[PDB]
Structure formats: structure tokens, C-alpha cells
Design a protein around this ligand. Structure first.
Ligand code: HEC
Ligand code: HEC
Ligand code: HEC
Ligand code: HEC
Length: 107
């Protein structure tokens, strides 16, 4: 694989950018997030062309918002899906990991 980013990286939506830190995710398998595509590894940006390249819609597979924020049933684990499980076990982190405002994603 390519080297994991060693600093927070931009995740660009259509109007907001959220910084994503790899370090707290070191125990998460890369493929949880960088899931296989057509049975092959890929580490391309989630919003690249042909992937989750609808940066304005809130719903549906092509939506970057949806694959980040859906709490619902998805074929891969979303940020908010996993974080909901983490905060169940570490409730002190509820706002940090799941808040829509004043969270670590949206400070
Ligand atoms: C989800 C919790 C992740 C885990 C686990 C890993 N990465 Fe990641 N990575 C993730 C995101 C949301 C992003 C930003 C993507 C975007 O569209 O902006 C990244 C980015 C990278 C990159 C750079 C991609 C690019 O700019 O072309 C690389 C090379 C990368 N990630 C590698 C990587 C590896 C090797 C991991 C396991 C050691 C790994 N990531 C875990 C989300 C997540
Ligand atoms: C294009 C090569 C992609 C890249 C890069 C990323 N994703 Fe993706 N994703 C892609 C497809 C073709 C699909 C549908 C088939 C499948 O593998 O399930 C998905 C699916 C997801 C999902 C589930 C969506 C749903 O069930 O509606 C999630 C949560 C998801 N992808 C997340 C995700 C993230 C966070 C990515 C960057 C780290 C990412 N994908 C890259 C195609 C592609
Ligand atoms: C589980 C499979 C995860 C997925 C998918 C994502 N995150 Fe996560 N995140 C996870 C853990 C276990 C932790 C650490 C909690 C703890 O016990 O401390 C985190 C933490 C973050 C943070 C906070 C980091 C800090 O400020 O100290 C951020 C900003 C964060 N995660 C963002 C994030 C995003 C944007 C994700 C989807 C692209 C995402 N996480 C996925 C576990 C998991
Ligand atoms: C980190 C785990 C996040 C938490 C908690 C919340 N959001 Fe978020 N949000 C996150 C990312 C990685 C991004 C950028 C990628 C994308 O387009 O989704 C965003 C962006 C938004 C936006 C702007 C969308 C755009 O196209 O610019 C909105 C309006 C937004 N987020 C809403 C939102 C709400 C309502 C939240 C509480 C449920 C929330 N976010 C939490 C990552 C994270």
C-alpha cells in the first residue's frame, strides 16, 4: 500500500472541509475505510470521479455525505456508524465523535 498519511488530511465536501486524522485509527484495518473496489485494493480519494463523487446530495451510494454520516445500514462502515459504537463504550466522547457542532470533525 501507499504510506499512511502521518498528519491530518482534508476531506472536502462541497461547502465544508473536515480534517481526518489517521493516528487515532491505527487499530482500524485500512480496508475498513479504503474498501476494495472490483475486488482490488484502492486508496483513491473517496470523492474522486466515479466513486462518491456527488458532494452535494445527502443520500445514496454516490453521496460523500451519506458514506460519512449515515447511521443507517451500509455495505461498509461509515464514520458515524463506527463512532456511534465507540461512544456507546466511551460515552465521554459523544460530542467529540458524533456531534454536528463543536465536535472534533466540526469544531
Ligand atoms: C477510516 C477510519 C480510515 C482508515 C482506517 C484508514 N484511512 Fe486512509 N484515509 C481515510 C480518509 C477519509 C482519507 C481522506 C480521503 C479523501 O477523499 O480526502 C484517507 C486518505 C488516505 C490516503 C491519501 C489518499 C489521497 O490523497 O490520494 C492514503 C494514502 C491513505 N489514506 C492510506 C491509508 C492506509 C495505508 C491505511 C491503513 C494503514 C489507512 N489509510 C487507514 C480514511 C481511513
Ligand atoms: C471508487 C474507486 C471508490 C473509492 C475510492 C471509494 N469508494 Fe466507497 N464505494 C464505492 C462503490 C463502487 C461502492 C458500492 C459497492 C460496495 O463496495 O459496497 C462503495 C460503497 C461504499 C460505502 C457503502 C455505501 C452504501 O452501502 O450505500 C461506504 C461507507 C463507502 N463506500 C465509503 C468509502 C470511503 C469512506 C472511501 C474513502 C476512504 C471510499 N468509499 C472510497 C467506490 C469507491
Ligand atoms: C471505527 C471502524 C472507525 C471508523 C470507520 C472511523 N473512526 Fe474515527 N475514531 C475511531 C476511534 C476508535 C477513535 C478514537 C476514540 C478514542 O477512544 O479516543 C476515533 C477518533 C476520531 C477523531 C477524534 C480524534 C481526536 O481529536 O483525538 C476524529 C476527528 C475521527 N475519528 C474522524 C473520523 C472520520 C471523519 C471518519 C470517517 C472518514 C472516521 N473517524 C471513521 C474509530 C473509527
Ligand atoms: C466526523 C466523524 C464527523 C462528524 C461527527 C459529523 N460530520 Fe459532518 N462532515 C464530516 C466530513 C468528513 C465532511 C466532509 C465530506 C462530506 O461532504 O460529507 C462533513 C461535512 C458536513 C457538511 C457539509 C457537506 C458539504 O457538502 O460540504 C454538513 C452539512 C455536515 N457535515 C453535517 C453534519 C451533521 C448534521 C452532523 C451531526 C450528525 C455531522 N455532520 C457530524 C464528518 C463528520
Amino acid at each position: 500500500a501507499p504510506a499512511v498519511p502521518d498528519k491530518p488530511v482534508e476531506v472536502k465536501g462541497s461547502q465544508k472541509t473536515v480534517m481526518f486524522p489517521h493516528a487515532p485509527h491505527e487499530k482500524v484495518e485500512c480496508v475498513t475505510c479504503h474498501h476494495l473496489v472490483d475486488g482490488k485494493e484502492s486508496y483513491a480519494k473517496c470523492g474522486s470521479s466515479g466513486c462518491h463523487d456527488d458532494l452535494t446530495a445527502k443520500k445514496g451510494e454516490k453521496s460523500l455525505y451519506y458514506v460519512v454520516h449515515a447511521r443507517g445500514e451500509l455495505k461498509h462502515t461509515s464514520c458515524l456508524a463506527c463512532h456511534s459504537k465507540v461512544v456507546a463504550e466511551k460515552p465521554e466522547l459523544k460530542k467529540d465523535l458524533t456531534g454536528c457542532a463543536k465536535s472534533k470533525c466540526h469544531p
